[PDB]
Amino acid sequence: GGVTLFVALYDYEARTEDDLSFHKGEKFQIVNNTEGDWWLAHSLTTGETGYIPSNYVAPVD
């Protein structure tokens, strides 16, 4: 029940236009995960939406 938030395991610097840069510990809601391993995500820190590499995050317990 409810949503699953994700937390960054490592810092990341974006290298392409629609990707987010983020810090370890930053939390996200996943907006879309049906297009491959880059997920469209919404940061709970910044309020921005953009792609993140899905192997940089883990589900929050």
Curated annotation (Swiss-Prot):
It is found in: Cytoplasm; Nucleus; Cell membrane; Perikaryon. Phosphorylated at tyrosine residues, which can be enhanced by NTN1. Isoform 1 is highly expressed in the brain. Isoform 2 is expressed in cells of hemopoietic lineages, especially T-lymphocytes. Residues 2-61 form the SH3 domain. It comes from the Eukaryota. Signal peptide: none annotated. Interacts (via its SH3 domain) with PIK3R1 and PRMT8. Interacts with FYB1, PAG1, and SH2D1A. Interacts with CD79A (tyrosine-phosphorylated form); the interaction increases FYN activity. Interacts (via SH2 domain) with CSF1R (tyrosine phosphorylated). Interacts with TOM1L1 (phosphorylated form). Interacts with KDR (tyrosine phosphorylated). Interacts (via SH3 domain) with KLHL2 (via N-terminus). Interacts with SH2D1A and SLAMF1. Interacts with ITCH; the interaction phosphorylates ITCH and negatively regulates its activity. Interacts with FASLG. Interacts with RUNX3. Interacts with KIT. Belongs to the protein kinase superfamily. Tyr protein kinase family. SRC subfamily. Non-receptor tyrosine-protein kinase that plays a role in many biological processes including regulation of cell growth and survival, cell adhesion, integrin-mediated signaling, cytoskeletal remodeling, cell motility, immune response and axon guidance. Inactive FYN is phosphorylated on its C-terminal tail within the catalytic domain. Following activation by PKA, the protein subsequently associates with PTK2/FAK1, allowing PTK2/FAK1 phosphorylation, activation and targeting to focal adhesions. This is Tyrosine-protein kinase Fyn. It comes from Homo sapiens. The chain holds residues 83 to 142 of 537 of the full protein.
